[PDB]
Amino acid sequence: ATRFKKNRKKRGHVSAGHGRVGKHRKHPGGRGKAGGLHHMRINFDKYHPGYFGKVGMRHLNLLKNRTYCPTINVDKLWGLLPEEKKKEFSENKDIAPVIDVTRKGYFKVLGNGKLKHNQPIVVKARYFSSVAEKKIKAVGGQCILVA
Amino acid sequence: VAHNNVLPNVHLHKWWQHRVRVNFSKNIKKKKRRLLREKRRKANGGTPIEKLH
Amino acid sequence: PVANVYSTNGKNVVGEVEIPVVFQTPIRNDLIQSVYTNMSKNRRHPYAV
Amino acid sequence: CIWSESAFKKLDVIYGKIHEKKVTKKNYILPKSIVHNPDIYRIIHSDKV
Amino acid sequence: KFNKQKSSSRRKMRKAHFTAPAGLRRKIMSSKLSKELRLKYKTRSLPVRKDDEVLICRGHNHGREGKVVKINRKRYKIYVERVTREKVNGESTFIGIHPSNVVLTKLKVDKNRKKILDRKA
Amino acid sequence: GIALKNVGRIKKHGRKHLVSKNPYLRLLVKLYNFLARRTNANFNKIIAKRLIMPKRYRPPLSLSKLQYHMANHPNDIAVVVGSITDDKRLFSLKQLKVCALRFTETARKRIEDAGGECLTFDQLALKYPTGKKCVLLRGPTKARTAEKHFGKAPGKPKSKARPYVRSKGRKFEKARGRRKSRAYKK
Amino acid sequence: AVKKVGKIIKKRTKKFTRFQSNRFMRVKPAWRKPRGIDCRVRRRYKGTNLMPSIGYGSNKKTKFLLPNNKYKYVVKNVKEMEPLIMNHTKYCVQIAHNVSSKKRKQIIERAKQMNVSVINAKARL
Amino acid sequence: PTKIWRRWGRKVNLKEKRYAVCSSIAASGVTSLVLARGHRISHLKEVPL
Amino acid sequence: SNVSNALVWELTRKSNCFIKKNKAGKKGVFLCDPLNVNYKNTPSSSGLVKSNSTNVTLKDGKVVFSVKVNQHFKMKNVEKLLQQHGSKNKEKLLKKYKRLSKLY
RNA sequence: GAAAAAAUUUUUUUUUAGAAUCUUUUUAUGAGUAGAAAAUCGUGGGGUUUGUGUUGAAGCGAAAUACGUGAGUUUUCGUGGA
RNA sequence: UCUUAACCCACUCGUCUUGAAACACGGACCAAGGAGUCUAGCAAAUGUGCAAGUGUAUAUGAUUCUUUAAACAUUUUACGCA
RNA sequence: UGUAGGAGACCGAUAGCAAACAAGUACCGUGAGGGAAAGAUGAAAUAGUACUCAGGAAUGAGCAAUUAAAUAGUACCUGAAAUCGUUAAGAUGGAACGGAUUAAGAGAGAAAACAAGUAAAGAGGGGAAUAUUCUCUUCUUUAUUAAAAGAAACAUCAGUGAUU
């Protein structure tokens, strides 16, 4: 590290890259976030707009795991098949892939993107978006609610 | 300038250098654990120290 | 791509064997230099007073 | 580097996907980037080029 | 070395050499044994006693043979009869010889030394 | 004493050399510099510049984007001055012949399986030294993480950008200066 | 002035002496520019003390050349002669300071047999 | 004064480390590189021994 | 294949054991590789690059052929070696041989 | 890919480049504190390489037809004894 | 090279300072020591590896047990960030 | 933390524990307390400065004398700078030193700053031939023919001026 640092660039130059007029002082604005509102307000406004004051209720003891949900969009569901499985379904319209999204850790199925139309697929999941259910039904697939 | 972050999140003002501990014992502890487990495993007649949970 | 295998005396030669695919792998000398230095950093001790 | 025939052969097995079920690098083998030769002088000399 | 209990640091080894007990000093007052005797007992080396007979192999006095006068165990010098030296005033003392500069011919053999020779055999 | 601006200097900007220490990439810029200089082809000159360009600013291309771009081309030889990444969001059947700086292993395997060609830059130079009957492609910059962060102030009004924010928590940046109710909004 | 010799122009006689080292014992004699500081002599007040810059530099053809018309090559072992020999016309031998006399004699004799000038061969007798 | 911690544990990835070993073994394969490294090697029959 | 003569030069452009550059003024960089026939540092000079080479060298007062019942005791020679094993270059080899023959 | 000179058609002598941040060539340009950059140079240790050591090293003092724009490098003589 | 000469030029350096040769300040002299660092967390830049994944965390394993206080491996589908 | 180990990409005597040592000592403070400076002869002093002369005595000197070495002599390794002594050289009318430029003195040096080859007789090394015959080569020496190199001077050009 020490080979390449700023001291090696400035070593004989007296004011050290920190200004002959200025003369580098211990804490020339005071500590940390102190100048907010008071004299660094312009910095806070232009770079940190939401910062000051309160919003909303207090939950007091939230717990993350109650609301924990990983989501997946329908577009990427056929991608959860390996290559040979995807070829096999593409060939054969007699059978649908069943997809248990839980093994892949997902719990809500969302509606984004296109599908290769006229091919059934069974989606098993806890939760589905309104659009996702409609598109899965539209393409001839099935939605299965399961805990 | 200083548009990288609103805050320092560092909070070391409760005299951190007094409180501090530096840790690099890892492998040596593992060897001690291995030695202890080897000694136990051997000592019990070779009879498994594992137990079904 | 066969390489000759040798005996205990180097003038006597046994069965030729197809080389490992490793010897066709990319040579990243700069990567090796960075890895060596980083590994070395993990090996040497910082010194307190 | 001086290799035993055993070591040399084992090296091929290591990067060959043989034995040890699905374990090796969690179903992975072999650094194998597409950086490549033919040597540069051959490419320029090449009659079409 | 291959043992990882015993130190290989220079500092400690030197310290042990310098602050050595008398028995330790006696141990390192060993000399190589003369070639036929070496063959006879298959013994490389013996600790010298005061009345032994050495040949000198190193220093300006190499190739002088003779009886050992006195041993100084402490500062690692044996004294041999024909390595005399006069002092600055002309008075005669013996030149001190490091024990690794000499090869031992005639050992004086006591009961204890004989028991050691028996141990070596 | 002459009056010239910038003391008469022409001062070029951006990369002045490739600063990578990679032997293969140094060999490749030697090759493409030679190919550009001798041919005087615009295709080669672009390749040389894109090879010199920062590795971070060299983009990934999506396989979906590559296929979407190549759709009107019956000639199959795609050239990409970046990395080609795979797609897990569609069937991705139709093969191509693609030269790229780097291939993901999954993408390469799919392209090879489909009956395509994953082509080296040395192979491209050898076969197609003029670049004729080919298609040069770029992956998109598409507002990368730094680009999302920067661009003439996120806290200014009438601007869309990401500030620093650690907004995984609940009580994070939403009030005074970002809110029409509390003082004012951006 | 300057020192022309054949097609070899050397443009600097009188190597520079560090400012104020004439007045003060503490200041080292070997040159230093007062670049790190304001100093009123970098401000080019005429005749105060001349100071160096790149322009005095040697010509590209003669760049490191000796008046021998031969580049100096320093030799500390005999085997280092062997690549050097085919360019003996354009290079001259310097034998390193730290060479023991038996070896030095051997190197001198061998170098003379190899037919290249050795500039310190007339020393360490 | 030196505090005890001066970055004793650095990372460098599993993939990077693996790459360095494979590429170094590949490099060890190469005859020119063996000579270039300073090994005396003229009378060895060929470098992959 | 992975190896390339050019790639070796790119690898050894700065770094090789037998590259030697003078400290007392930088002008002159030599290549001490005995597989070379010309001993300045360039990849054209270098035996690392040279195609599948076989070479007549110089060691300890002897003409040497070095190589890429038993017979034992228990300049014209150089000319003979060149005419046998062969490959501008011939003239350069002749020049080296002339120097080596005239005085060792 | 052959140029010249010495000899007495034939012998001898000098030279005889390919390092792509490299080499040849052209033209323009050169102020500078605060300040930013790049190229270097030197010191302690380590890995690596191939060397220097008691026919005297490091160090030191006096110097050098010495080298480099320069920082400095190298060397000679004297001391010196690892 | 050193040495005086003689001609021409040449005001105490450092300093804060609009402005220092100042009747502004520090400096009797010489030697050695003597000042932008380290950690944490963040950012952009560039290099480097992999990619819709990535990072083996803690930890287990070994004919790992001068070096070895790291190097090696990941069960004959945790967590960070995206 | 105490003791016992093993360590080190640590410090190397103004550093590093305050302490490499007869240091938590000397010494200082009414006292609570504060708290240093301070390593190195040589291989061997079981090699430690013998002896003589001149000296009141210190000491000095030696044609004397230890040691490889005493300008290694025990407040002993190397021994920088400030500072000061001897000798020599120069200088010197109310500063001093410097830059730029020549001069005259005093020193040093021959490697670019001249002499390839030939004959005579000394020293080496090789190669071939079948440990020794033939022969190829480099240094010293005597004298004996070349030459090249730079500086001059004028002429001749090209570029640039000034002149009438």
How much helicity do the residues of chain G have? 10-25%
Instruction: Determine the strand fraction of chain G and express it as a percent band.
Output: 5-15%
Question: What summary fits the major beta sheet of chain G?
Answer: 2 strands, antiparallel
Q: How many DSSP H or I helices of chain C?
A: 1
Adjacency order of strands in the biggest sheet of chain C? 1-2
Major pleated sheet of chain C: 2 strands, antiparallel
Oligomer state of the chains in this structure: part of a larger assembly
Spell out the helices and strands of chain C N to C: EEH
Q: What structural class do helix, strand and pairing data of chain C support?
A: alpha+beta
Shape of chain C: elongated
Terminal residue distance of chain G? 38 Å
Task: Give helix % range of chain C.
Answer: 25-40%
Widest sheet: strand ordering of chain G: 1-2
Overall 3D form of chain G: elongated
Task: Please tell me about this protein's structure.
Chain H: This is Large ribosomal subunit protein uL4. Chain H: Belongs to the universal ribosomal protein uL4 family. The structure is cut from a larger assembly and holds nine protein chains of seven kinds. Chain B contains two helices and no strands. Chain B is mainly α and 53 residues long. A two-stranded antiparallel ribbon of chain C has the order 1-2. Chain E is α+β, with helices and mostly antiparallel strands. Chain E contains four helices and seven strands. In chain E, strands 2-1-7-3-4-5-6 form a seven-stranded mixed β-sheet. In chain I, the strands form two sheets. A two-stranded antiparallel ribbon of chain I has the order 1-2. Chain I has 104 residues and is α+β, with helices and mostly antiparallel strands. Chain I is built from three helices and four strands, in the order αββββαα. Chains in contact: A-B, A-F, A-G, B-F, B-H, C-D, C-F, C-H, C-I, D-F, D-H, D-I, F-I, G-I, H-I. The interface between C and H is medium-sized, with 27 and 27 residues. Chain G binds three RNA strands through strand 4 and helix 2.
Summarize the structure.
This is part of a larger assembly, with 9 protein chains of 7 kinds. Chain C has one helix at 29-43; strands at residues 2-3, 17-18.
What's the layout of helices and strands?
The structure is cut from a larger assembly and holds 9 protein chains of 7 kinds.
Chain B: H1 16-19, H2 26-43
Chain E: H1 10-19, H2 22-27, E1 30-33, H3 35-41, E2 45-47, E3 53-56, E4 65-72, E5 77-86, E6 92-97, E7 102-104, H4 111-120
Parallel strand pairs in E: 1-7
Antiparallel strand pairs in E: 1-2, 3-4, 3-7, 4-5, 5-6
Chain F: H1 23-39, H2 42-52, E1 60-62, H3 63-70, E2 77-85, E3 97-103, H4 105-114, E4 117-119, H5 121-127, E5 135-137, H6 145-149
Helix pairs in contact in F: 1-2
Chain G binds 3 RNA strands through strand 4 and helix 2.
PDB class: ribosome
Keywords: ribosome
Entry title: Cryo-electron microscopy reconstruction of the Plasmodium falciparum 80S ribosome bound to P/E-tRNA
What structural keywords apply?
9 chains, A: three-stranded parallel sheet, three-stranded parallel sheet, elongated, B: mainly alpha, RNA-binding, Ribosomal_uL15/eL18_sf (chain A), Ribosomal_uL15_CS (chain A)
